[PDB]
Design an enzyme around this catalytic site. Structure first.
Site, PDB file in Angstrom:
ATOM      1  N   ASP A 253       0.793  -1.213   0.000  1.00 55.02           N
ATOM      2  CA  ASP A 253       0.000   0.000   0.000  1.00 55.02           C
ATOM      3  C   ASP A 253       0.830   1.270   0.000  1.00 55.02           C
ATOM      4  O   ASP A 253       0.298   2.345   0.141  1.00 55.02           O
ATOM      5  CB  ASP A 253      -0.968  -0.029   1.209  1.00 55.02           C
ATOM      6  CG  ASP A 253      -2.288  -0.711   0.878  1.00 55.02           C
ATOM      7  OD1 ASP A 253      -2.445  -1.133  -0.279  1.00 55.02           O
ATOM      8  OD2 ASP A 253      -3.183  -0.838   1.750  1.00 55.02           O
TER       9      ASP A 253
ATOM     10  N   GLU B 237      -3.340  -5.530   1.097  1.00 58.42           N
ATOM     11  CA  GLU B 237      -4.200  -5.915  -0.010  1.00 58.42           C
ATOM     12  C   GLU B 237      -4.802  -7.278  -0.028  1.00 58.42           C
ATOM     13  O   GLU B 237      -5.037  -7.779  -1.083  1.00 58.42           O
ATOM     14  CB  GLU B 237      -3.529  -5.768  -1.342  1.00 58.42           C
ATOM     15  CG  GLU B 237      -2.082  -5.876  -1.375  1.00 58.42           C
ATOM     16  CD  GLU B 237      -1.582  -4.817  -2.318  1.00 58.42           C
ATOM     17  OE1 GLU B 237      -2.301  -3.806  -2.506  1.00 58.42           O
ATOM     18  OE2 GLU B 237      -0.490  -4.977  -2.858  1.00 58.42           O
TER      19      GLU B 237
END
Ligand SMILES: [Mn+2]
Ligand SMILES: [Mn+2]
Length: 183
Positions: A17, A113
DNA sequence: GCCTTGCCGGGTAA
DNA sequence: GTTCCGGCGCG
DNA sequence: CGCGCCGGAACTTAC
DNA sequence: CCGGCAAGGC
């Protein structure tokens, strides 16, 4: 050691991220950034930042943790040549991660994720070589999994963790107590 | 019967 | 997630 | 003079 | 990332 587990976990969050950025400016100015982005200020300021703070302190890094608000997410940023390279050199060595670092990395990557509903256990990424490394680690931990090209539009693969091994993946990786923020 | 997992477009959270 | 921007620090 | 931190935010797209 | 759909497995 044993800042190495926390490092691996932050690398997971950064790869997923955030990112490692080397800037060049007019001149001969420069900047090195370690970045984690996230929508909530909790889990940025309350979980991620103190883990980063711990590492910065252990590693003797002089830079601030900056939290910059965006219209669509928050950005944790460390501007630091030392830490940029610390994490970049670690990424290069990713194949040599021990079990502790393996699990921590996969935990941070999933947080970044993974599929959060955990109705399905899925990790998304364009980086197929990366997911293939995670897949072999997972096979060694007895967690069956497959990789295929999920999103044809963006060239984005999914590694699907088999629900046969759901309890082993959640127990062993996701709710792992390994290397906590620190007693 | 019930579960799992590939497929595939929408748009939020990177 | 990525790269621009102006501005400051420091030998 | 020559790089490396700070604080922001526009711009894009990979989850 | 999310989540509906439908194929396929036991
Ligand atoms: Mn990512
Ligand atoms: Mn995320």
């Amino acid at each position: 050691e044993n800042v190495s587990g926390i490092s691996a976990y932050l690398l997971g969050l950064i790869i997923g991220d955030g990112g490692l950025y080397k800037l060049k400016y007019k001149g001969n100015r420069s900047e090195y950034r370690v970045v984690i982005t996230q929508k909530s200020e909790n889990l940025i300021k309350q979980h991620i930042a103190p883990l980063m703070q711990f590492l910065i302190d252990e590693l003797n890094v002089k830079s601030k943790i900056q939290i910059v608000k965006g219209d669509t997410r928050y950005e944790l940023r460390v501007s630091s040549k030392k830490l940029y390279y610390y994490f970049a050199n670690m990424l290069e060595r990713i194949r040599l991660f021990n079990m502790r670092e393996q699990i921590a990395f996969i935990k941070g990557l999933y947080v970044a994720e993974g599929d959060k509903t955990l109705k399905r256990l899925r990790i998304w990424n364009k980086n197929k070589a990366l997911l293939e490394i995670v897949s072999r680690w997972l096979n060694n931990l007895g967690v069956r999994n497959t990789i295929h090209l999920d999103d044809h539009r963006h060239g984005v693969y999914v590694l699907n963790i088999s629900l046969r091994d759901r309890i082993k993946f959640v127990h062993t990786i996701l709710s792992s107590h390994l290397n906590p923020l620190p007693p």
